Amino acid sequence: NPIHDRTSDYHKYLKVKQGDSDLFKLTVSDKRYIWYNPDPKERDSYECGEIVSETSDSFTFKTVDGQDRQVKKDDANQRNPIKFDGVEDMSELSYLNEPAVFHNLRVRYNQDLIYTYSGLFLVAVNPFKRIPIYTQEMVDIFKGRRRNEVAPHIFAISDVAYRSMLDDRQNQSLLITGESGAGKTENTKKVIQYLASVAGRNQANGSGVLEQQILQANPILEAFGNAKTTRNNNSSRFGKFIEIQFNSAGFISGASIQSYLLEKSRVVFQSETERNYHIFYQLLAGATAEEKKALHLAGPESFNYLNQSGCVDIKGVSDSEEFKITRQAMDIVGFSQEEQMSIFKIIAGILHLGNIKFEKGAGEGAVLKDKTALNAASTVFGVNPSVLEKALMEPRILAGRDLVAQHLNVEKSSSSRDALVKALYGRLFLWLVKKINNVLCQERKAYFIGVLDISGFEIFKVNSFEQLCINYTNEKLQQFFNHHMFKLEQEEYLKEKINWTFIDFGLDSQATIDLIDGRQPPGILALLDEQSVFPNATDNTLITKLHSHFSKKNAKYEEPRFSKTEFGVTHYAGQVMYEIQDWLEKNKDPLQQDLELCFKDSSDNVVTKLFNDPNIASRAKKGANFITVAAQYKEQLASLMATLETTNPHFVRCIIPNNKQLPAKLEDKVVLDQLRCNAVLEGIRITRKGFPNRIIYADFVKRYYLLAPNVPRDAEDSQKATDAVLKHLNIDPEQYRFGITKIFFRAGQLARIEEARE
């Protein structure tokens, strides 16, 4: 075991770097320290405070500056004994207060260790620097060992999830969730990879066929789904749910993927300094004049879906060659030659529909002084150019009982084409998922290691509809970890030789989970999906009802004191104000109907299958006709949670270092404020509710029995032996609650013997 080998990098990389000695002749003082934040204002940003007299209430001070301010007995965030700093399970801690939490990891992150265990949650802060914790030799270690057995590292979360699958014979699920850019996909990508060797199908070391088939799906799910943004460069327009399929005899079979809402509108809008889908900025470089010609193409700047952005290039990124990498992960999936010209050549239309400009002069009606640019979409789509517009400008619309071709004004006209776009990108993203799925996921399935990555509720300036959705989730998945731990808090509840007094919770987050989704009495998507069908009433009247029902009667809600387009719900993180622009127009999500009418018929096997194959456009039944996008979401959701309500979960709370995207500095502002709102802290403050500090009971008796020369170094049954240092150091029965295998020395008075004397 390289762990023996001191030199073996794993010591310097993932471990605090155990020092030579293990005795009391080491880290030494005898006093007590408390965390104080010197400014009577700014909360975050604490500083070391010294204690002067542990009085009944008035805690005594000596500020780093040397002052004498005095806080109460119950608000002075005290500071953990140093024997501990940079310890793997934050649970081990005897004081869990925001500073005393941000400290134990500031330091470890500081020593180049990014991974620290906390209760269950593997917390990991994002480096931004390239670190060698991923080599095969790495794989080789965390293999077949216990969480405690070896280092805090992602590989552990899985090997564990892995053996587990085949020792209980139930499917499992890893959950990587947290702040944007915060890095889920970098680990989510390294776990699947661990799933590549420990259970790796390769007969001989490496991979065979399914492995790369499965391994180069990503380049794909990225060049089309992923965008650069303000908080990342590999930002994820959607979310995903990949499970890995094995047999009863220990090996991989096929696999899975489950995408959610794309940033479908980003296709047509790139805020300053943010780019459109990555594939767009590749197909224009990694090709030839037999490809630009093959599909009318000018340099990646002439397109008004790419320049309006304010940026194209990516510091340190061969967009040009980044394209090759993705064309091979196609070939491997058996992506055929005709199969790629079509995906792209079908993308290329979406570029052009952009260089098309709706002019206007027939009184008020848009027209086209230039047919050239359409001459391509009609061209590369292989549809009607005359109707393409003729269905564009004057579509037939049913007003009452009559079929009457209208003519949208200079504005509603272009706007309508702008719909024919997400349509290709949604349906096209969609078909790329169906396709992988087909060549990867088998039928005779057995166990699964479900990996889902999707975004924690992050709060922002405008919060359009799309988001009321992705908190709906982090409100649901948040309730889960809340509930699951309760049912597990019954177990150790059965065997300690005494079974504690029934404890209940229920999660008050339930009131809000209704506010959003409730049928009777109805909630946001309920009264929303009601007006989504009347095609006359508008936002103002809608943002007006969500105030009728709730303003002043429903606790978790806040009508805007002033704005008449806002409204505010309150989540597991707190208040959020939402917008009402097109909420109606989008749950509704329409598109003029002579378009599916005219596209349904094409020269393509992939242009046509998207408008003709209901496994693509249609939803399920209800309203009187095809259901609505928020309706779909609510049902498609529980299909998942009720798909974890049978497996063993595995959690990963991801944490970002700074919103500046730079390595080697930890904002004591950003980081500490991803902490307090997310349950990571919260699910262990709860279990502390008794004694947060719990241990294997092999250590304490070796960790402290000489300050009381009564219990030895090698006593065999401390069950009858470690006792002799309690009736001599003197810990009252309330002062702790031990166990018959493990122990948890008092919820509070523990350091009075842990940091001071032998």
Ligand SMILES: Nc1ncnc2c1ncn2[C@@H]1O[C@H](COP(=O)(O)OP(=O)(O)O)[C@@H](O)[C@H]1O
């Ligand atoms: N543990 C890590 N080591 C090195 N780089 C990382 C690590 N975690 C994240 N990154 C980098 O941070 C960037 C953002 O992380 P990412 O995994 O893409 O998060 P997300 O998908 O949530 O936006 C990535 O482009 C990646 O380069």
Ligand SMILES: [Mg+2]
């Ligand atoms: Mg991702």
